[PDB]
Design a protein around this motif. Structure first.
Motif, PDB file in Angstrom:
ATOM      1  N   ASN A 179       1.071  -1.467  -0.214  1.00 39.56           N
ATOM      2  CA  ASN A 179       0.155   0.039  -0.205  1.00 39.56           C
ATOM      3  C   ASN A 179       0.848   1.136   0.396  1.00 39.56           C
ATOM      4  O   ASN A 179       0.800   2.364   0.520  1.00 39.56           O
ATOM      5  CB  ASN A 179      -0.826  -0.050   1.150  1.00 39.56           C
ATOM      6  CG  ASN A 179      -1.895  -1.221   1.251  1.00 39.56           C
ATOM      7  OD1 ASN A 179      -1.670  -2.259   0.690  1.00 39.56           O
ATOM      8  ND2 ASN A 179      -2.457  -1.032   2.320  1.00 39.56           N
TER       9      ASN A 179
ATOM     10  N   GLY B 163      -4.925   3.564   3.303  1.00 42.69           N
ATOM     11  CA  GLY B 163      -5.645   3.040   4.362  1.00 42.69           C
ATOM     12  C   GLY B 163      -4.279   3.575   5.775  1.00 42.69           C
ATOM     13  O   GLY B 163      -3.887   2.133   6.011  1.00 42.69           O
TER      14      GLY B 163
ATOM     15  N   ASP C 213      -8.766   3.826   8.214  1.00 41.16           N
ATOM     16  CA  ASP C 213      -8.522   3.650   7.069  1.00 41.16           C
ATOM     17  C   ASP C 213      -9.052   5.243   5.718  1.00 41.16           C
ATOM     18  O   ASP C 213      -9.797   5.474   5.280  1.00 41.16           O
ATOM     19  CB  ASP C 213      -9.909   2.711   6.568  1.00 41.16           C
ATOM     20  CG  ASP C 213      -8.932   1.385   6.790  1.00 41.16           C
ATOM     21  OD1 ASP C 213      -7.909   1.044   6.925  1.00 41.16           O
ATOM     22  OD2 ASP C 213      -9.974   1.001   7.373  1.00 41.16           O
TER      23      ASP C 213
END
Ligand SMILES: COc1ccc([C@H]2COc3cc(Cn4cnc5cc(C#CC(C)(C)N)cnc54)ccc3O2)cn1
Length: 282
Positions: A23, A45, A50
């Motif tokens: 991510n 997030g 998030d």
């Protein structure tokens, strides 16, 4: 004042910080040295909510060994124990598993201060206060900084200043402000130079030199070469003159900070307060 219950350079990493590198898409490199670097990125997030956002990730280059790869973890470890403060470049998380170490920080959208001033050759006072607040915090954890200077101050949205340290993501090796001494000599307190001693009272000195950087970004001791002559000058108590854009009061802080007896120098606490008074009078 502050009591130290524990020292963070001898505590192991706290895995609550860990964030999964998948991510995280690298944007542009923001700064680099010959052992590591720092690059924009988007963390999907992040935090206990998030939310996506923009960040900076510090990390090693190819060329690292037990010297540097550890010194990054030290920085990581020290940083997990200070935890947040508006006037500091805060740790958001790390990646310590499944690859080289990635240290994720606030992205400060306006970059370093020395350039923000050089760029533009009450605002000057906010910067001084904000940096002073940040150091008072590091001081309250008995964390010595060792490289306080304008080059290591950052400017986030709404021109709020946060202290930081680029560490391995700075070309110290090709930067003439860092002298080989088997070190940023122009910023150092005499006890740090002559006697390898390094206190919060040393960092006040360096914070003196940073205020003089009110010269709108001049190189300290302008036109004075670092050599035998320069060390004698600073032991015999020479002080840079008042900058052009310094209020007299403010130069009084600098001369206070450049007291030869470390204890005769004020504390980040005092400076913050003297700065607070001088604020509504402006
Ligand atoms: C003693 O306590 C501390 C606190 C923070 C730090 C580290 C945290 O890791 C850092 C990471 C950064 C990197 N960083 C954050 N926003 C940035 C923005 C830029 C830029 C730029 C533009 C304006 C686009 N030219 C470059 N680096 C940035 C800067 C300082 C740091 O200090 C070290 N010791």
């Amino acid at each position: 004042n502050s009591y130290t219950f524990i020292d963070p350079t001898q505590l192991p990493y706290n895995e609550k910080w860990e964030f999964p590198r998948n991510n995280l898409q690298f944007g542009k490199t923001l700064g680099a040295g010959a052992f590591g670097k720092v690059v924009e990125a988007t963390a999907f997030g992040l935090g206990k909510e998030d939310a996506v956002l923009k960040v900076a990730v510090k990390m090693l280059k190819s060329t690292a060994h037990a010297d540097e790869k550890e010194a990054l973890m030290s920085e990581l470890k020290i940083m997990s124990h200070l935890g947040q403060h508006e006037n500091i470049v805060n740790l958001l998380g790390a990646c310590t598993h499944g690859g080289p170490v990635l240290v994720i920080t606030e992205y400060c959208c306006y970059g370093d201060l020395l350039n923000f001033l050089r760029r533009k050759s009450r605002d000057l006072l906010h910067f001084s206060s904000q940096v002073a607040q940040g150091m008072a915090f590091l001081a309250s954890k008995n964390c010595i900084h060792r490289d306080v200077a304008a080059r290591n101050v950052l400017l986030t949205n709404g021109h709020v200043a946060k202290i930081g340290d680029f560490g391995l993501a700075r070309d110290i090796m090709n930067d003439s402000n860092y002298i080989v001494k088997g070190l940023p000599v122009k910023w150092m307190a005499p006890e740090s130079i002559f006697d390898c001693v390094y206190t919060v009272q040393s960092d006040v000195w360096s914070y003196g030199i940073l205020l003089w950087e009110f010269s709108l970004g001049l190189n300290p001791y302008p036109g004075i070469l670092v050599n035998s002559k320069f060390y004698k000058l600073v032991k015999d108590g020479y002080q840079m003159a008042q900058p052009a854009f310094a209020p007299k009061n403010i130069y009084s802080i600098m001369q206070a900070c450049w007291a030869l007896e470390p204890t005769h120098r004020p504390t980040f606490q005092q400076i913050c307060s003297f700065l607070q008074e001088q604020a509504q009078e402006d």
